[PDB]
Symmetry: D2
C-alpha cells in the first residue's frame, strides 16, 4: 500500500518464528471460552503517539521519519494521516483506536474555523469507518496543549478559558457520538496547580465539578451512551494534578455527587508515578466498580517522568489481566496502547515492532492469568486464609451481631491467638510455574 509499503499485514506465526513482522503469542483467531483472543483483549491504537508524535523531547528536535512529513499545508497533513492510520489499522490488525479531537485536525484562528476543519476530517474518517473493521474505542478533548490552558481548563482562573473548554468538550462529545465511540475520556493535564501560593484550591475543585456536571447533562441531552472515564495521573506537567490516583478521583466524585456517572481509565505509567503498582490501582478500581478501561504501557520505576513505553514485562501483564478477568472481562473498555516508540526507534517499521511487542506481551499475560483464575490458585489460599470469619465469633462480626462489649467478653476468655503463615514466597514461586508452564 501507500505509506508502509515495506510492511505487509502482520500475522500470527508462533513462539518459534524468526520473522520480526509477526505475532509470537497473539493469535487474534484463537478461541478461549467462546470468544476469540481479539474480542477478549480489545486492542486499541493511540492516534496521538502513533501518527503525530515526532521524537521531539525537552532537550531535542524531531527524529521520526514519516511518509506524510513532506506536506506543508496543515489540512493536507491531516488527510494524509487518516489514510496512513487506516492502512496501519489494517496491517496491525487492530479492532479499535482512540483519538483526541486535536490529534485529527488542526486548529484555526477562531473556534468556528477549528470546528469546520474538524468536520472535514470527521467526515473523512466516517467514510473509512464504513469499510474498515476498526472502530473507535474512545474519544477525548485535548485541553492541555494550547497556550490558553496555561492556568488550567475548567480550573483556569480565567472564565473565558472555562467557556472555551466547555465549547471544545461539547464539540468533542458530538464527534465521539457520531463516530460511534464507546467511551469518552477526561485527562486533566492542566487541572492541578504549580504553586499553592496563588491557588484557590476549593474554588478550582468546585469549578472542575461544575464542568464535569455540565458534561454529563449534555451527554444525556444528545443521547450519548458511551461510558465517561476519568484518567488519573499524580503530576506532570503540573506539580500536583487533582486526579492524583483512583482514590483521589473517588473522593472527588463522591463529594460532588458525580460518582454514578464515571469510571476510571487506568494507565500503568501513571499508577507507578503515584507510587502504586499497576495491579494495586486495577484492583482498587475493580472492588469499587470503577475499572472502566486500561491504557496499556509501562513506565520505568527509576525514572520520575511519564515514559509511555510499550509494555514487555509479561509478569506485569499477567497480574494486570488477572484483575480484568476477575471482574468478568472488559465491557466497553479495552487495552489502548498509550505508548510511543523510543526517540531512537525512528524508522517507520518501528511503529509495527513496538505494537507487536506490546500485543504479544498482553496476549501471553492474558493466557497465563486465565489459567490462574480457572485453577483458583490464589483464591483457594485466600478462602482458607480468611476461614475464621465463616463461623464462631468471625461470623458474628460479619453479620452485625458483635460489638465492642461482646468482643471484649470473648477476648478476655481467649489466652492464645495463633496465626498462620502468609506464604508470600510460595505464592510467588507458583506464579512462576504458571508463567513458564
Amino acid at each position: 500500500n501507500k505509506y508502509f509499503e515495506n510492511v505487509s499485514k502482520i500475522k500470527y506465526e508462533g513462539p518459534k518464528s524468526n520473522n520480526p513482522y509477526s505475532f509470537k503469542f497473539y493469535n487474534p483467531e484463537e478461541v478461549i471460552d467462546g470468544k476469540t483472543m481479539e474480542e477478549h483483549l480489545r486492542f486499541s491504537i493511540a492516534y496521538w503517539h502513533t501518527f503525530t508524535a515526532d521524537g521531539t523531547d525537552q532537550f531535542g528536535k524531531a527524529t521520526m521519519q514519516r511518509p506524510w512529513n513532506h506536506y506543508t499545508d496543515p489540512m493536507d497533513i491531516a488527510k494524509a494521516r487518516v489514510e496512513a492510520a487506516f492502512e496501519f489499522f489494517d496491517k496491525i490488525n487492530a479492532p479499535y483506536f482512540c483519538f483526541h479531537d486535536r490529534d485529527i485536525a488542526p486548529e484555526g484562528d477562531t473556534l468556528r474555523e477549528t470546528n469546520k476543519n474538524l468536520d472535514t476530517i470527521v467526515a473523512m474518517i466516517k467514510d473509512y469507518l464504513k469499510t474498515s473493521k476498526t472502530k473507535v474505542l474512545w474519544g477525548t478533548a485535548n485541553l492541555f496543549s494550547n497556550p490558553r490552558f496555561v492556568h488550567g481548563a475548567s480550573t483556569s482562573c480565567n472564565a473565558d478559558v472555562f467557556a472555551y473548554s466547555a465549547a471544545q468538550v461539547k464539540k468533542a462529545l458530538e464527534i465521539t457520538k457520531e463516530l460511534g465511540g464507546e467511551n469518552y475520556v477526561f485527562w486533566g493535564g492542566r487541572e492541578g496547580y504549580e504553586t499553592l501560593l496563588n491557588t484557590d484550591m476549593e474554588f478550582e475543585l468546585d469549578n472542575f465539578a461544575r464542568f464535569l456536571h455540565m458534561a454529563v447533562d449534555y451527554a444525556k441531552e444528545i443521547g450519548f451512551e458511551g461510558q465517561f472515564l476519568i484518567e488519573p495521573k499524580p503530576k506532570e506537567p503540573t506539580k500536583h494534578q487533582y486526579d492524583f490516583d483512583v482514590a483521589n478521583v473517588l473522593a472527588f466524585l463522591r463529594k460532588y455527587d458525580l460518582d454514578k456517572y464515571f469510571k476510571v481509565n487506568i494507565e500503568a505509567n501513571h499508577a507507578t508515578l503515584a507510587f502504586h503498582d499497576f495491579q494495586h490501582e486495577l484492583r482498587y478500581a475493580r472492588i469499587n466498580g470503577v475499572l472502566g478501561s486500561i491504557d496499556a504501557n509501562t513506565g520505568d520505576m527509576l525514572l520520575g517522568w511519564d515514559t509511555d513505553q510499550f509494555p514487555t514485562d509479561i509478569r506485569m501483564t499477567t497480574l494486570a489481566m488477572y484483575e480484568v478477568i476477575k471482574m468478568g472481562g472488559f465491557d466497553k473498555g479495552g487495552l489502548n496502547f498509550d505508548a510511543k516508540v523510543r526517540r531512537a526507534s525512528f524508522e517507520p517499521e518501528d511503529l509495527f515492532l513496538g505494537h507487536i511487542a506490546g500485543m504479544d506481551a498482553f496476549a501471553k499475560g492474558f493466557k497465563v492469568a486465565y489459567k490462574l483464575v480457572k485453577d483458583r490458585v490464589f483464591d483457594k489460599f485466600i478462602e482458607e486464609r480468611y476461614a475464621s470469619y465463616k463461623d464462631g465469633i468471625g461470623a458474628d462480626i460479619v453479620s452485625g451481631k458483635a460489638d465492642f462489649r461482646s468482643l471484649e467478653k470473648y477476648a478476655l476468655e481467649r489466652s492464645q491467638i495463633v496465626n498462620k503463615s502468609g506464604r508470600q514466597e510460595l505464592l510467588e514461586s507458583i506464579l512462576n510455574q504458571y508463567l513458564f508452564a
Copy 2:
C-alpha cells in the same frame, strides 16, 4: 529534681541568647490577638518517642542513656517513666502530651492482666494530672507492635485478632475519656497489605469500616466527646497502607458513611512519604473540613522511610501554620511532636535540645504566617487573579446559569483569550521578605 537534675526549667531568652537551654523564638507568654503563644500552638509531647524509644534501629542496638534504665521489673520501669514524664513536662513547659495505651504500661500474659497493669498506671497518671498544668491532647491504641497483629488488626484474616483489637480499643477509649483526652487517634500501622496475591482487599476494607463503626457506637455509648482522628501514612511497615493519604481516607469514609465522625491527624513525614508537600495535605484537609490535628515533625525527602526528625525548617513551619491560621486556629487539635532524637543524640539533655529546636521553629513560623494572613499578601493576589468570575460569563458559570450551549455561543464570539502571569517567583520572594523581616 530526680531524673533530669542537670536541666532546669526552660525559659524564653530571645534570639541573641547563647544559653542552649532556653527558647530563642518561643515565648509562651507572648500575647497575639487576645491569646498567648502557648494557647495558639498547643504543643504536645509524644510519650512513645520521648520516654520509651531507645535508639534501636533495624541495624543496631540501643544507644539511649536513660535514668530509669536500671529497673528490671516492667512495672517499676512504667512507674519511673510517669515520674520522669511529669518532671519533663514541667521543665519543657508543655501544655499537652499524647500516648499509646501500650506506651504507659506493660502487657501481661492475658488481656485481663494487661488491663490491670494499665489501670494501675492510669490511676497514677491521674494523681499527677491533678497537680500538673499539662493535659492529655489525645490517646490511641497500639495495634501494630504485638506479634498477633502480623496480618493486620481489624484487617486481620484471623477473626480472633479482630476481637482482640475491639477489646483493646474499647479499653483505650475508656482510659482516654478518664484522663480527659480531647481527641482519639487511629493509626493503621498494620492495616494494609504486603502482597496482593493473598489479600481479599474488599473484605479487609469492609471489616476496617465495621471496626471503625463499632468504635463510634461505643464512644457515643460512654459519652466520650473527643474528636476521632485517622492518621494517614502511605506505607511502612506495610507495602501499601489503606489510609494512604488524606484523599484516600476521605474516599473510604464517604463510601462507608463514616465521614461525619472523623477528621485527620496529618504528620509532615507521612505526607512527604506519599509525595505530597506537608502544606498540600494541610490545605486539602482544610477545604474539606477535616484538618483536625498535626504531628509536628519532618522527614528527609531523599530518604524513603519515616525518620520522625524534629522540625527545624522555618520556611516549612510558616507554610504549615499559614493553613492552621486560615481555618481559624486549632479547635481540639494541636502540635504533637511525633519526633525522636537521632540515634547519635543519646544523652538525656538531647531530649530538651530536640524539643527546643522544634518549638522555636514552629513559634517563629506561626509569627510569620500570622503577618502573611493579616496583611492578606497572597489573598489580594488570589482575588485579582480569579476576578473574571465576579461578573460576566464567569458569574453565570458560578451561579448555575451557564451550560454547554450558552458557553459555546459565548466562546464562538470571542477571538482572543488573554491570560496574565501567575507570578510564582514574585510570590516566593515576598515570602522571603516576610520570613526575614
Copy 3:
C-alpha cells in the same frame, strides 16, 4: 533430623511438580558446558537472615517460630544454631554459606571474652565442615550493630572505636582464613554521615582508607588469599553511606591507591536503592574488572528501604546472569542469598520455600541468559550497530590517528549524517521469545 523434622532433603522434580518442597527449575546435577548447574551458580546461604533474624521490624516484635528459641544461655543458642545450620545446608543442598563474626557467637563483656566465645564456635563449625559438603564463601565483620559504632567504625570520631574496629577485623580475617573462606567482605553500614553540620568528610574518608590499607597489609601477613570485596549501599541506616554505588567505590579506591586489592559485592536491592538497575551495576563492575560476587535478592522499587526479598523475577535474574556469563562466570564469588522471609512468613518451612523460590528463579535465568549469550542475540546487533568504527574515519578515531583538526576537515566535507534505529522494542520482544521458549 532434629530441627526441621517435617522437611526432607529438597530434590529436583521439574516444572510440573505439585510438591512445594522440591526444585522446579534448579537441577543441581544438570550439566552445561562441562560444569554442573551447582558449580555454575555457587548458591550461598546467609547465616544472619536464615538463623538469627526473628521477624522484628521497626514497628513490632519477633514473629519467627524457631526450634532453638527455648534456650536461655547465649552460648547454648549459638551451638544450637550451628547444628540447625548444617542440617539446613544439607536439606537445601547448598554448596556455600556466608556469615558475620557476630552472627555465630555472642559478645562478652570484653574483647577477650568475645574472642574466646568466637573460638569455641569456630572450633565447632570446623568439625562440621569436615563432614559437610557446604563450604564458606565469605566471612565478614559486623561493624554496625553494637552501640559503640554510633558515629561509625573506621569513620568514628572516637579513636578508641577505630582501634576496636581494627581488632575485630583482625580476628575476623583470622577466622575466615581458618574456615577456608574464599572472599572477605566489607559492608560499611555506619561508614557515612547523618548530618554534614558535624562531619569532617575528608578526615573520615582518610581514616576509612587507612583502615582498609591496614586490612590488606594484615591479610598479606597471615597469607589470606581470599578476594577482598566492598559492598555498596547508598544509605540506611546512614543518610549518606560513603560506598554509595560501584562508581563511588572506584573513585575512592583509585584516589587512595587501593584499587588493585578490591572488587565489589553487588546486592540487587542496594543497586536499586541508589537508582541504578541491578544489571547496570553488574555491567559497570564487569567492564571495570571488579564484579566479584553477588548478593542475590530483590527490593521493591516503590519502597525506599532495604527489603531483602527472595528474588522471583526471572526477567531480572536472566539479565543479571547474562552479565556473569559475559565475564566468563564466577571465579571466587557466588550467589549469596542476602534475603529474608517476610515477617508474615514465620513458620520454619518458609525458610525452605523462600530459598526454593530464589534458587529456581536464578537457575531459570541462568539457562535463558546462557542461550542469549550462545546465540549472540544482542552481540550481533551491537556489532552491526557500531560497525562505522571498523574502517574509515571511525578506525582513525579508535587508533589514535584523528584529532580535532583532521575531524573538522572530515566533518565540513560531509553533508548528510544518516543514523539507524536503536531497535529497543524489537530487542525486548526477542528477550521474551527466549524467556518463554
Copy 4:
C-alpha cells in the same frame, strides 16, 4: 530602552522596600573583607533560558511573550536577541553570562554555513563586549538538540557523529577563547544510554575519554586558558547519563588519566535528581579539589525531572555558600542562573522578577554563611568532636605508626568505650539563630 521599556535598571532598596523591581538583600556595592558583594558572588545569566526558552513543555506550546518574537528570518531573531541580552545585562546588573554556541546563532544546511552564521553573531557580541561591563563566564557546545545526536555525541555508534561533535567543540573552544570566557563546560546530555540491550558500555566510555582528551590537546594548542568543567546529571533525556554525579565523574577521570584537567560545574537540581543534597555534592567536590563553578537553581524534590527553578530557599543558599567560602571563594567559577521562569510566568518582566528572587536568596545566604564561617560555629564543634585523634592511640593511627597488631593490643586492654552526642538538633537550631539574626 528598546526591549524592556517598562523596566528601569534594578537597584538595591533594602528588605523593607515595596518596589518589586529592586534588590531586597543583594547590594552589589556592599563591601565584605575587601571585596564587593558583586565580586564575591559572580552572578551569571544563562543565555538559553533567558533569551531562547519559550514556555514550551512536553504537553503544550509556547506561552512566552517576547519583543523579538515578530521576526521571521533566523538571523534577524539572533541579532535582536543579542541587543535584548545586553539591555537585560545592564538592567539586571549582571557581571557575567554563559551561552551554548547554538543559543546565539542558527544552524545552516552544512557545518560551513553554521560556522559562518556563528562568526557573524560572535563579531556582534564582541562589539557589545567592548562597551558592556558584563563578561563571558563560560561557553559550551550544544551536543544534544540536533537529531544527529540521537545515539549520543562522542558516545554515538555512528563515527560521523563523533567527527561532527569534534568539529563543533573545536569551533566552540575557539569562540569561547575569542570572547574571553573563563571556563568551558561539558554537559553530556546524550552521553548515556536508553537500553543496555544495544549498548557497548566500555566502547562508549573509551570514546568519551578519547573525545575529552582531544579537547584538552586542542585547548593547549590554541592556548585557551579557561578551566574545563564537566557538569553531572544522573539522567534525562537518557535513562542513565554517564556523568551520573561528582563521584562517577571522578571515577571516570581518574581511570582515563584526565583528572588533572577537569573540575565540575555542580547544578542543584542535578544533584537532588541523583538523590544527593546540593551541599553534599558541593562538599564532596571541595575536598577533592574539583568544585569549579555552580549552576544556581533548585528542583522540586517531589518531582522526578529537571525543573530548573529560580532558587528561593535561603536555608539552602546558606548551606551552599558555606561550602564556597570554606574553599576560599570562587576562582574562575561563579553562580550561573541555569533557571527559567515557570510556564505561567510568561510576561517579559517575570524575567526580572525571577532573577531578583534568586540573586536576593543567594546574597542573603552568602551573608549568613559568612558569619557561620567567621564565628567558626560548626568548626569548633568538629574540632572537639574528633579530638581523640590529636594524641594517644589516635595520633598513632593518623601518623602511620599503628597497625592491626598494635591496635588489637590496645583494644584488648580497654574495657569501656564512651561516645558523646552528635548534637544534630542543637546544631540545626544554631543555624536558625544565624539565619534569622
